[PDB]
Amino acid sequence: AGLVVNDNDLRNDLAWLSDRGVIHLSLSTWPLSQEEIARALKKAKPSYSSEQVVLARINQRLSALKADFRVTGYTSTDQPGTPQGFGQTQPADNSLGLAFNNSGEWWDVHLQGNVEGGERISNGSRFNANGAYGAVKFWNQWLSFGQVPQWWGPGYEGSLIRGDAMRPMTGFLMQRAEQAAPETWWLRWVGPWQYQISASQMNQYNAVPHAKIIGGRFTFSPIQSLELGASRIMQWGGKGRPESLSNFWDGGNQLAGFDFKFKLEPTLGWPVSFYGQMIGEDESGFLPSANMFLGGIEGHHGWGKDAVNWYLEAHDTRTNMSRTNYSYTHHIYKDGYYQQGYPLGDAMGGDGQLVAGKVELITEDNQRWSTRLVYAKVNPENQSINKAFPHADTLKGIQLGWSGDVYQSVRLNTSLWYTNANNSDSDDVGASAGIEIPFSL
Ligand SMILES: CCCCCCCCCCCC
Ligand SMILES: CCCCCCCCCCCC
Ligand SMILES: CCCCCCCCCCCC
Ligand SMILES: CCCCCCCCCCCC
Ligand SMILES: CCCCCCCCCCCC
Ligand SMILES: CCCCCCCCCCCC
Ligand SMILES: CCCCCCCCCCCC
Ligand SMILES: CCCCCCCC
Ligand SMILES: CCCCCCCC
Ligand SMILES: CCCCCCCC
Ligand SMILES: CCCCCCCC
Ligand SMILES: CCCCCCCC
Ligand SMILES: CCCCCC
Ligand SMILES: CCCCCC
Ligand SMILES: CCCCCC
Ligand SMILES: CCCCCC
Ligand SMILES: CCCCCC
């Protein structure tokens, strides 16, 4: 029960089911309420065997994720050269995680400890409690405290406003549990809708210590084919900053924009969707300005009993696809829209252009083969505020992956990549490998 933070295997399986019309479920605001996954599963309409295979995997995964005790591990030769997608940015070359889990009807507790080797992202200590939260449920709302990662929007490679490519921040978070449409007769048109609010404290944020990220996101689906999102973030507070309830208003540094996802299955019967996101650095009342852009197209197919996932996605984190040295920059918050050098927005940082494609096959067996190509111009102004991509570079890379159960429930995750670069700080070739061991108590 409770929150379900960024998992990549889960998301792709849910997205497959959703875009094929077998379930109806928003996947553009993480973490997801499990109670909302459960509801969509109870009104699931499969018609192929491939679809029953994927379906059965959903609860199996949530059992894995929320097992009483869970040991996780990651090791690698080096940092990947290209930026990584949803659920795929590791903060160190070598990691080891121990988590105690417990949840019920009205509670979710995830006590997570991590120890690290060969830091990529800076920290106070090689020990940390990232991902660690406790949550309680009341009146269909989940209230959470901890270091919970989020994902805001329909993109697979990044969120332009609140992503994953950075250490999760300590704070409060609130959400609907079940996300049904409003009962009120004159609001029933809105459809399934969801809010997320969060107040967080930035870590080691030099230029203005203890800076807060306060934010809000709203989504709704008026028709099964269209989801619409809105989200806003303000960088606020800190040492030498106004921190009054008064100064805290909306009328700091702001980011704000919209996203959408349009499913084609309900009309053309194609298990294909397209999506977009537009976040701006300034706000013209109702619309944003100084805009970063993101768009993509995704498909989801059955083979025999196997499943195939693919997406093609383009990002532009310049200002209006031309102007540089303003995206993820600020004049008060001078370290920019980054924690410990790593972007709170898109994995690239600001002023970046990115096209990426990914295909993956998933066996009945639940082996998962993947292939990923990417082209990326990054940090053209060699901005120090971005430690993810310190230098102006053009990246042309390929990344292969394999996921599979090795022994009973012990799962192994490998990766292998090559990156053509002009001035990277990481080996042109490398390989990583992760492990998951769930235990009962
Ligand atoms: C003390 C240094 C951190 C511990 C690193 C352990 C990494 C092993 C992961 C194995 C996965 C195959
Ligand atoms: C000492 C740390 C080195 C860890 C490198 C392990 C990478 C193995 C993955 C192989 C996949 C093809
Ligand atoms: C068996 C009941 C255990 C409930 C523990 C939950 C306490 C953590 C809540 C923190 C949310 C702000
Ligand atoms: C039923 C279809 C099975 C064929 C799958 C072969 C293609 C996977 C290639 C993986 C390369 C990383
Ligand atoms: C079972 C489908 C054929 C397997 C193709 C092997 C290629 C090795 C890719 C390894 C990626 C980590
Ligand atoms: C029946 C389950 C056994 C599967 C074992 C697969 C081992 C893959 C290891 C490859 C590491 C590079
Ligand atoms: C300095 C560049 C050397 C990179 C060595 C790591 C690559 C290991 C991947 C292949 C495993 C068989
Ligand atoms: C057996 C239940 C343990 C719950 C721990 C909660 C910590 C606040
Ligand atoms: C079902 C009653 C619980 C209300 C708790 C309110 C938390 C601020
Ligand atoms: C059964 C209702 C539990 C409410 C918990 C609220 C704690 C803040
Ligand atoms: C169960 C509460 C976890 C809080 C961890 C945050 C400390 C930085
Ligand atoms: C059932 C009425 C809910 C009120 C919230 C309306 C969502 C925009
Ligand atoms: C550099 C070490 C490579 C290990 C591959 C199994
Ligand atoms: C009853 C709806 C609550 C929304 C909290 C912002
Ligand atoms: C309460 C959600 C706020 C989102 C506004 C864009
Ligand atoms: C028969 C399918 C071939 C797939 C090549 C990647
Ligand atoms: C991504 C592999 C091709 C790189 C050479 C331009």
Numbering used by the authors: 24 to 274, 288 to 477
From the article:
Wzi, an integral outer-membrane protein from Escherichia coli, has been implicated in the formation of group 1 capsules. We conclude that Wzi is a novel outer-membrane lectin that assists in the formation of the bacterial capsule via direct interaction with capsular polysaccharides. Group 1 capsule-producing strains of E. coli secrete CPS into the extracellular environment when the wzi gene is knocked out, with the remaining cell-associated CPS unable to form a coherent capsule layer (Rahn et al., 2003). We propose that Wzi exposed on the surface of the cell acts as a lectin to bind to nascent EPS as it leaves the cell through the Wza translocase.
The 2.6 Å resolution structure of Wzi reveals an 18-stranded β-barrel fold with a novel arrangement of long extracellular loops that blocks the extracellular entrance and a helical bundle that plugs the periplasmic end. The X-ray structure reveals Wzi to be an 18-stranded antiparallel β-barrel, with the wall of the barrel describing a circle approximately 36 Å in diameter. Visual inspection and analysis with PISA indicates that Wzi is a monomer. The first-ordered residue is A24 (residues 1–23 are the cleaved signal peptide) and the last-ordered residue is L477 (C terminus of the mature protein). Not seen are residues 275–287, which form part of an extended loop between β9 and β10 (loop L5) and the C-terminal His tag. The barrel has a striking α-helical bundle (α1-3) that precedes the N-terminus of the first strand. The long extracellular loops—L3, L5, and L7—adopt distinct structures, parts of which fold into the barrel, whereas loops L5, L6, and L7 extend beyond the circumference of the barrel wall. The other loops are folded into the barrel and completely occlude the pore (PoreWalker [Pellegrini-Calace et al., 2009]). The lengths of the β strands are irregular; β4 is only six residues long and results in a triangular “notch” at the extracellular face of the barrel. Loops L3, L6, and L7 pack together to form a complex, positively charged electrostatic surface consistent with binding of the negatively charged sugar.
